[PDB]
Amino acid sequence: VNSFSGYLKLTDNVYIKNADIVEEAKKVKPTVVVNAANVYLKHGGGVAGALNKATNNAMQVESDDYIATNGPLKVGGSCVLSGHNLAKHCLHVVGPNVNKGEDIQLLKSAYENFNQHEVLLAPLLSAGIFGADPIHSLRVCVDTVRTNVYLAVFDKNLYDKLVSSFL
């Protein structure tokens, strides 16, 4: 038993809700919140900009130190950093950005990072400003992640659409 509330169960291990991940995170304090990161951990917009703003820019400060030490992530890769006031940990995961020409097949590799964590609160990778089809992202999520994932979908219209079209 865990503290997530109001989710629709899609499969044995995947759950979905219409929620703001920032507000969802501040209420659950999950062990892991996933950020829709880029390779530079520059949290300007989308999910990343919103999560970072909720940390009063502490996420960005920590991220800049990480990059200065380690260099950029790989597309499809991840790193674990602090969750600040939102979660114990933040798993920064880089899905391919279609608006940058990155190969969509890397979306499966991106979701594989979730399997290193028993339970996660997460957005749909490569959705929103990353330019991929969210219906495809949900399919890859379901077919790749084996751990327990609670997906927060900000937009209500898209949420209804994802549910109604789910196979």
Ligand X SMILES: CCNc1ncc(C(=O)NCCn2cnc(C(=O)O)c2)s1
CB of 4 or CB of 154, closer to ligand X: 154
Residues at the contact surface with ligand X, assessed by CB under 6 A: 20-22, 46-47, 50, 53-54, 123, 127-128, 153-154
Nearest approach, Cβ of residue 91 and ligand X (Å): 15
One DSSP character per residue, the chain reads --S--SPEE-SSSEEEEE--HHHHHHHH--SEEEEE--TT----SHHHHHHHHHTTTHHHHHHHHHHHHH-PPPTT-EEEEE-TTT-SEEEEE----GGGT--TTHHHHHHHGGGGSSEEEEPPTT-GGG---HHHHHHHHHHH--SEEEEEES-HHHHHHHHHT--
**Closer residue to ligand X in complex, CB, 76/123:** 123
Nearer to ligand X by Cβ, of 70 and 165: the residue is: 165
Q: Closest distance between ligand X and the C-beta of residue 158, in Å? A: 7
By beta-carbon proximity to ligand X, the closer residue of 73 and 132 is 132
111 versus 154: smaller Cβ distance to ligand X: 154
Query: In the bound complex, what is the minimum distance in angstroms from residue 78's beta carbon to ligand X?
Result: 17
To ligand X, the closest distance from the beta carbon of 1 in angstroms equals 26
Q: How far is the CB of 71 from ligand X (least distance, A)?
A: 27
Place of tokens 């997906």: 151
